[PDB]
Design a protein around this nucleic acid. Structure first.
Ligand code: NA
Ligand code: NA
Length: 91
DNA sequence: AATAACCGGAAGTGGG
DNA sequence: TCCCACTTCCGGTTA
């Protein structure tokens, strides 16, 4: 099953949910969620995963924070903004 | 207060 | 057995 960071990177590449997520500076790997439309993207993540409960942005971001230590995704000090690692961007 | 973004410990679920 | 990669729940902080 796909990993959350890859789900997000794939969305950014495909542009299929452009109103929910977008690059801030794609060269740096920085991206930002929509305040008003992030839940639709979270819902899609849960359905793609086959999870028992409805996925929420709160729970999705709880998972995102766990990447801080290993480094795949880090929180940026900007509203709803995160950053992929160079390794994630390359791989 | 109402709303929103952000936080993480702890325990549960999946598939190795 | 016991870690993976989250998920779910809860209580919380800051603006
Ligand atoms: Na929020
Ligand atoms: Na603010």
């Amino acid at each position: 099953k796909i990993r959350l960071y890859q789900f997000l990177l794939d969305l950014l590449r495909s542009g299929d949910m452009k109103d929910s997520i977008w690059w801030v500076d794609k060269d740096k790997g920085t991206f930002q969620f929509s305040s008003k439309h992030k839940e639709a993207l979270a819902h899609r993540w849960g359905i793609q995963k086959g999870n028992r409960k409805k996925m929420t942005y709160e729970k999705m971001a709880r998972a995102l924070r766990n990447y801080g230590k290993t480094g795949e995704v880090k929180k940026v000090k900007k509203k709803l903004t995160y950053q992929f690692s160079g390794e994630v961007l390359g791989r």
